Symmetry: D2
Subunit: 306 residues, 4 copies
DNA sequence: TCGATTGGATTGTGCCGGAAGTGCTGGCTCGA
DNA sequence: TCGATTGGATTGTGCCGGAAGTGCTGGCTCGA
């Protein structure tokens, strides 16, 4: 009766996700990791927070892929991140193959969210080896990236962060396409605020660069991004589990949109109870489309290196 | 802990008190000139603290004395008419009375005016209460746009809150529905029109429905009060928690859109100090014409108090 | 995918329930009433509040019992309340028969919460005519009554209302059994607070009487109780829908507990995803058991008058 | 809007900052003596305002100067040891330093101390900060009882929060687990024992597990910080929103249980003025003996700073 | 013989204990 | 001919409009 959420990967992001799931009473949680005992420990700690949250989510740890059985949602964060980053692609491909095989056998009706980087490659690899329908698997990207852009704008303009809307498309990572044309504040075009000298074009460009550079900025400060990534993922999962039909930018299978096929890329989607209910194709101008093309080209380049 | 005084404990007051307890926003005084009724509603509501895990006192009052020390005052009191100018003098008197009490008892309160016609009444209460211009606003845009957003969202099959829209000028039949400023998930509505997911004609139809929603509800033998209460609490909460939401509300115009000495609906930023920013939209000529018509109607009615 | 909640009765309590369901994003709502148009109007108003709540619940009105089809939860508030109150029993019995027939045909797997008074009679009548399992139908009583007791105690002692716990059993209504022995404050027996002179036995008796008399107190003040009843009902429904397994005092079929069978009465229950998961029989002393007996006797007396 | 300063930005600090943003409770300063790290964590956390619909500033600091104007200060800084007395002098020094700064910069702040051994450290910080006795408490009972409540709830198949329990005296191996005060849905646990739904032996086993939970987690290669952070935020929130929850925390004893000049765990009421009530449990002789043992251990360690 | 999962406390990092103290390494088992 | 669903705005209350103004009733349709 309660949803089963399996976290494939119980690292930094996995931990925060389990915490938020208990806070929101969203479902039972399996914290899976190939590393022995650690996820069981994290699960034990997290389970006690049910009391403070007035929730009732079972939180367990697992080192067995057999616990994917009957999952309603599967969130994949596991994979190599440390020692050229391209060198990690064949390793993580192998991991995606393994996971895919289990999903196919044990929870083929699950909704799958992929986080492992580079996400636009990894999500397609898992799609190919899991056999799940295209409307049932997406990758994390736009919700996180746009949360950075929205937040920075909101702080310059002194408004509620959620009241800034913005779209970032194409791919997660350094080739992300920031669409200046599509930024609004309380529903009002950003350009009105630029005209009123509340923010300059220069400052906006600085905020674009900071958005692109945020992960590196956090790592250079001897931290790692996992709170905002976890919150973004849980926003996606919750939109599925509660059939909210939020418009969220995620990585999805392109079937001709933006002139590309047989590749995943970031685009606004509607996430509801049946999974991806709508794929929205933005009416990009030529320059924006060129940037999208470049993002997709980089995804393809890396896909060839598995 | 904040003190919220509801001047008027009718059906919208009831829902407001319910939501304040749900959100644990502050202690509540339910005031009404009707004897005993607000005490009864307050008693009922107070028990819901248990279910909500909250701790808000909820009391009823027939005395304006209980305005003392209010942090927020929400005025819904006043004569109503189902969807005329005859309400203007009567309700003027009420604004005078309430105003005096605010002036004497809670001059630092943040005031939200709901009494219709709201764009007139909020200015009257502003004048008679003596509060600063950044500390008093009128309900309009949050409610009207909640209707517009909802109807569009159901045509496009998306989350209602993911539609954004601005309705300005005045709260009433002359409300200015700004088609150019509608977005869905941050995307201009024009893109959905181009893709034939919705038409210009359907958008105009939804504009008409939005304008006439209170009438539509009354024709169905109901009274609009749930959404109005929720809109008011969204405003009050943005103040109490310093959220700095952009919310369209009626505020004193000081030259914006070419108008002064009058209140009108415009996007505002609501935070801990009250109205922190009044945002003037860069309207084109046609839009400005519509805004002018809305303000002209407010002025016309103001002449009849 | 989203739960379907059908409110059979769209009066004062129904209205607040629909409002709270949207606030909590708990499910789609059908506001049913035999009265034409009114529920459609209330539904239209309530639906707009989805925007303020960041929810996505469809709220519709209905004058057709056919809309019970596929209900996951059915909440019955409809029935005569106005012109001896016993005179209303045969009328409301007829209503329970009608409703029951539709549940049997259209949503036999629904979880049913009965509110129509006198609830301990009405809930059994609906049980008998709906054919639903005994673990799938309960009546409102204890959550509401104890919310009054908890609140009044909490105000005298100046603590959080939820930190007072108390049990009231037997029946909803004037024969409710208030169990002084079972009152705690922050987990601490009330008697410790009486010993410390924070509250007297006299004051406690006054609070007991006020608890019994609360509905009358509100009506005498020219109001009607519907906010707290609605919140209590939604707490019950949510415990079912989200499998929380809260301990909640409700009216349920007695099968020998407290020495009674073939009758419904108020007792602590556990409400989870399968409905009533546990019926907890309190270890009452002789005096308490006599009071329970008297409550059940009144329920039987009224049941004979349909 | 409240200012919350986290003195210590380790793993428990991270979860605290995350929860404060989720609950929109106030602006957050993540302080640490470790350079750059809290700035990075704060930057990460700040973005989650968007997902949470909140507006809490989250900044990082390596300067005690940013204590200025804090409404709440949560101290987790200090040397740790996995589940000895050698921590006592070292952490004493830290309490002195932090204390001085509080005294100078936020003397009206509400202080929550977590640094172990907490019942000693909270008293040291009390002494060196000069804050009133009702404005400083130590973490213990909310966390320990969250474990006890959870384990019992899973044996009886009920909602974890519906188990109530008191653990008093001290936060550590001498914690006093009061079997007589356990309830389930308000019902004495003894009734469930009588019905054989759970046994006396299983309750003693769960007591043992509760005492040793941090060790159990560490043996599983993890570190307890999620539940501790959640407990701390429940305390802080009861202060910030004036909820008046009954929460077991370490507080200055002034004759309660026969002890003075020492802090110990007891049920408290936490509201807008701080500790509004210190509730002395009416313990029997055996329970009192256990309480005495807990306090005697705190005293023993206090002698070694 | 020789390395140790896609994770991590304070430190590093196959695990486990002792030492030092804003802080890692020596001595061990398991199984390829 | 004669009453009007288990609900309700401001008032009452089958519905619908006008009047008066912290506030109801006159004139109508539908269908038993
Ligand atoms: Mg490793
Ligand atoms: Mg009727």
């Amino acid at each position: 009766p309660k949803p089963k959420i399996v976290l494939v990967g119980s690292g930094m992001i996995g931990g925060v996700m389990a915490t938020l799931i208990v806070q929101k009473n969203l479902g039972d949680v399996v914290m899976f990791d190939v590393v022995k005992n650690m996820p069981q420990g994290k699960a034990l700690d997290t389970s006690h927070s049910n009391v403070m949250a007035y929730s009732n989510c079972k939180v367990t740890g697992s080192n067995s892929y057999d616990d994917l059985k009957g999952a309603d949602v599967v969130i994949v964060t596991a994979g190599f991140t440390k020692a050229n980053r391209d060198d990690l692609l064949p390793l993580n491909n192998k991991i995606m193959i393994e996971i895919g095989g289990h999903i196919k056998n044990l929870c083929p009706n699950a909704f799958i969210i992929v986080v492992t980087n580079p996400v636009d490659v990894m999500v397609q690899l898992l799609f190919e080896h899991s056999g799940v329908p295209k409307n049932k698997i997406i990758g994390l990207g736009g919700v996180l990236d746009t949360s950075r852009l929205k937040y920075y704008i909101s702080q310059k303009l002194n408004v509620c962060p959620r009241d800034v809307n913005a779209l970032i498309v194409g791919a997660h990572g350094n080739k992300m396409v920031l669409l200046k044309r599509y930024i609004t504040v309380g529903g009002i075009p950003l350009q009105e605020f630029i005209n009123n000298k509340k923010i300059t074009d220069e400052e906006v460009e600085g905020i674009f660069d900071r958005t692109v550079n945020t992960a590196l900025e956090i790592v250079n400060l001897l931290a790692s991004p996992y709170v905002a990534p976890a919150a973004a993922i849980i926003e996606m999962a919750e939109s599925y589990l509660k059939d909210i039909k939020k418009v969220l930018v995620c990585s999805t299978l392109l079937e001709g949109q933006y002139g590309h096929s047989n590749i995943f890329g970031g685009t606004p989607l509607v996430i509801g109870g049946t999974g991806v209910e709508q794929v929205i194709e933005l009416q990009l101008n030529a320059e924006e489309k060129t940037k999208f093309d470049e993002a997709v080209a980089e995804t393809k380049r890396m896909k060839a290196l598995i």
